[PDB]
Ligand SMILES: NC(=O)c1ccc[n+]([C@@H]2O[C@H](COP(=O)([O-])OP(=O)([O-])OC[C@H]3O[C@@H](n4cnc5c(N)[nH+]cnc54)[C@H](O)[C@@H]3O)[C@@H](O)[C@H]2O)c1
């Protein structure tokens with residue numbers, strides 16, 4: 141048995157910013173109390189993982205990144221009650237401790253045990269389970285899914301349906317749930333409304349899915365890469381616009397197209413300028429804009445607060461506003477009942493060993509989601 | 515009779531910025547089609563009127579300001595159906611045309627016929643009803659209440675209870691309704707919640723009234739003028755804090771006081787810094803912050819969008835989110851039914867001829883609302 145023992149396995153270690161991942165052997169300690177060690181089956185490449193590489197997102201290095209994944213429990217530490225060895229699970233990059241003021245709140249999901257706001261790159265106990273070349277390696281968001289085995293705190297894992305296809309449902313661990321929830325839960329898109337979605341990657345496509353599910357009459361996709369438009373229309377966009385085609389700023393174009401502003405807009409890119417543009421293009425009196433994209437570290441946007449005084453609502457969210465541990469199993473169940481589709485987001489499949497090629501595909505603009513198989 | 519004739523009367527004309535009002539004779543044309551001429555009875559001094567004087571707000575000059583008032587209809591133009599001569603009325607600085615997309619929207623109140631966004635300083639027809647010393651004088655927000663008589667568009671006036679005390683209910687024309695609605699309608703303050711209110715003038719006090727009416731457990735008033743604290747506690751503040759008393763930024767103080775951030779915060783001053791502070795002090799995952807204050811013309815704030823990404827909601831409003839013509843008569847009816855109090859807001863009552871003294875009282879920090887009586 142491997143239970144109670146250090147596992148040697150391959151992981152994708154990021155030693156330095158702006159460098160390829162190094163696929164090499166790591167040592168994965170056994171789980172301590174209220175920890176779970178997971179044999180990974182599939183992990184998606186989310187733009188936020190790339191942000192770690194580019195320095196857009198600052199987290200301590202060296203690191204094992206990865207946060208969108210699914211696997212099978214190898215072993216559980218003392219006191220674990222919510223998963224067992226052999227269970228299929230999705231790591232939760234937003235934990236759900238169930239005890240903090242946010243977890244107890246009907247609408248909050250950004251559990252105070254998160255490692256996002258001020259990343260330490262550790263387990264909840266402030267230590268690491270990973271060694272590489274004899275050196276400690278940081279965790280990422282308590283998940284570190286770019287490894288054949290990871291160890292996560294119990295509050296950062298959800299048991300999912302035993303019959304789930306892990307190579308699909310890993311997307312519920314970040315990109316699908318985030319985009320879909322941003323529309324259906326956070327914005328609360330209404331039937332007959334007009335939506336504008338900035339950024340047509342995996343997350344933006346999932347926003348469109350949610351807007352369509354909510355009954356939006358018009359869903360305007362916005363991207364500077366027109367190659368993204370065909371898939372956006374397939375999943376529900378009624379029109380697509382490329383800001384580069386227009387002389388005027390796209391907020392003006394979108395205001396004109398929507399006869400005075402859209403009902404709901406979404407920033408699904410990660411740029412300060414598009415966050416302000418997305419706000420501006422919603423109707424000034426009753427529009428709602430949701431920020432989903434991750435901004436470059438420590439940078440402030442500039443905006444005129446008259447955009448809000450007139451009546452706009454501006455909000456953001458992590459993980460689509462979903463309470464993670466409650467929601468992930470339900471989302472999987474709904475997927476299994478064909479309530480939504482994940483295949484439109486999956487454009488490439490690669491073995492884990494080809495992780496760098498998977499990032500190249502994202503960076504070139506060619507992929508939506510590449511799923512890596514272990 | 516005056517009907518159908520030019521009225522010569524007294525008004526407070528602002529000829530240029532940063533100068534006293536000139537109290538002198540103006541000529542007031544009779545109302546054209548769909549216009550209403552009102553004999554003013556009482557008008558309040560709102561900080562937004564002072565913003566015109568100070569240049570914080572830009573609107574065409576020379577101007578007859580004033581927007582918080584009540585009076586009695588002197589005459590109506592052809593086609594007016596909603597008021598008649600002799601009716602008590604409140605001018606509506608936010609109109610309610612009933613036809614535009616905002617008026618038709620269940621939540622929106624910032625009617626597209628407003629003269630706030632891009633002020634012209636005219637009637638709806640692009641002309642003025644005021645002359646002074648042979649010169650045309652601009653209107654202000656379609657109301658211009660600093661005059662013994664004004665002319666307003668029908669969409670900018672509401673009929674109110676004939677038994678209403680006009681020297682109190684004029685506050686429903688701006689400051690009471692704005693603050694109360696910002697809490698009860700826009701923020702939707704919840705029972706048992708913790709609120710922070712920045713600025714304890716007439717509008718901030720009305721926010722406190724609304725937070726208390728909504729059942730907030732804690733209502734923390736914030737002002738740099740500690741003389742404002744006693745009245746804030748009278749109307750429901752459970753604690754008051756002066757940022758000047760602390761070595762740390764007040765957002766940190768308020769986060770600590772509320773064991774991790776407030777449920778609802780309100781900016782009721784008009785400063786960019788306090789807008790960002792008020793946002794920051796609400797709980798990062800589920801907090802709501804509402805901007806009520808009017809900041810200086812054309813200035814942008816700077817903020818880190820991570821404040822929103824974690825889950826905060828940021829909104830603003832004009833006139834407390836109330837659809838003006840529907841809401842004003844109901845608010846007056848509620849006042850007459852003793853559902854809320856207005857006396858706590860009224861610190862001074864002066865003749866109209868003392869308008870400048872009234873503004874000096876506001877600027878010195880001594881008054882909440884001065885009511886000017888004609
Ligand atoms: N809030 C959350 O919980 C959460 C979850 C997942 C992803 N994210 C972030 O969401 C963003 C999108 O992630 P993704 O879908 O994986 O990324 P992606 O696949 O890189 O998609 C981004 C899209 O934005 C497009 N784009 C780039 N610049 C512009 C521009 N100026 N105007 C219009 N379109 C432009 C780009 O062409 C691409 O199709 C990233 O910033 C992620 O870090 C946030």
Ligand SMILES: NC(=O)c1ccc[n+]([C@@H]2O[C@H](COP(=O)([O-])OP(=O)([O-])OC[C@H]3O[C@@H](n4cnc5c(N)[nH+]cnc54)[C@H](O)[C@@H]3O)[C@@H](O)[C@H]2O)c1
Nearest residue numbers: 561562692713715716717737738739783784807808832833
């Ligand atoms: N959104 C609307 O529809 C609407 C309606 C009415 C008023 N307003 C605006 O709301 C604001 C308040 O109006 P009001 O109540 O008549 O004004 P006011 O009576 O001057 O009250 C403002 C209060 O803010 C206090 N203050 C000033 N600087 C600070 C600071 N740094 N920190 C904390 N407190 C501070 C000040 O001492 C005073 O008590 C003004 O900007 C108005 O223009 C907006």
Ligand SMILES: OCc1c(F)c(F)c(F)c(F)c1F
Nearest residue numbers: 186188197207256314434458
């Ligand atoms: O893609 C999800 C995601 C986020 F939304 C973040 F805000 C973040 F910091 C991060 F590391 C992450 F992975």
Ligand SMILES: OCc1c(F)c(F)c(F)c(F)c1F
Nearest residue numbers: 560562571581630688808832
């Ligand atoms: O006090 C109400 C009020 C406002 F909220 C404004 F935004 C404004 F421009 C103005 F002139 C005004 F009077």
Ligand SMILES: [Zn+2]
Nearest residue numbers: 237240243251
């Ligand atoms: Zn929690």
Ligand SMILES: [Zn+2]
Nearest residue numbers: 186188314315
């Ligand atoms: Zn992600």
Ligand SMILES: [Zn+2]
Nearest residue numbers: 611614617625
């Ligand atoms: Zn209207």
Ligand SMILES: [Zn+2]
Nearest residue numbers: 560562688689
């Ligand atoms: Zn006012």
